[PDB]
Amino acid sequence: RGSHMRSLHKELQQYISNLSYRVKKVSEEALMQMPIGILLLDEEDKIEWSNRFLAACFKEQTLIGRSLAELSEPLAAFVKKGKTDEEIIELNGKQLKVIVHRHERLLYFFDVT
Amino acid sequence: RGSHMRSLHKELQQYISNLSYRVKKVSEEALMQMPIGILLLDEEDKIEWSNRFLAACFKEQTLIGRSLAELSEPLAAFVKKGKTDEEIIELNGKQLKVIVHRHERLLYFFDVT
């Protein structure tokens, strides 16, 4: 209900500069040092933008609109609490990195093969 | 000796877009959701670029040229091993976030008040 990604616009439009908005195959900068998957949501658990690479590497058909709890149960409570900074669990053999701050405006989760 | 940050140029020049190279006071986007301190080094323990904000919040005069071990002992062994992804310790009252990958070209440490 409370879209954060689309509540400021500039905030997200700022971060999504250095990287291509297409986020497909990431052949532009290669994948040997940078995150293999990126996920960005609102302040409730509704995903907004995500780098395709993660889904493919997770064996999914569509990760968007799949809420947070559906994707993972351990971090489901975490996204509903925000009383921490970062955490790295493991899924599909790769680590699942989660990160949140104060105003969790920059809250995101990445994958770590 | 082997400056990774200056070995590619484009690699670092790409990431340093969204944010101002000035990195002073961060009044541009504020500090209520984003990292309070940024640090980037080579593949040995020689720091190359860092956001001033971290030093100030650490009670330092100059962090650049202070190697890795001089700043912190726990992560000193870590920077020389690279057998992990991320870790968050605590220093000066804020969490100290460290992150490394494969080719640790994007290896960096952030502070988490």
From Swiss-Prot, chains A, B:
It comes from the Bacteria. Residues 34-113 are annotated as: PAS-like. It is found in: Cell membrane. Belongs to the GdpP/PdeA phosphodiesterase family. Has phosphodiesterase (PDE) activity against cyclic-di-AMP (c-di-AMP) and to a much lesser extent against cyclic-di-GMP (c-di-GMP) in the DHH/DHHA1 domains. Also has ATPase activity, probably via the GGDEF domain. May monitor cellular heme or NO levels. The PAS-like domain (residues 55-162) dimerizes. Binds heme b via the PAS-like domain. This is Cyclic-di-AMP phosphodiesterase GdpP.
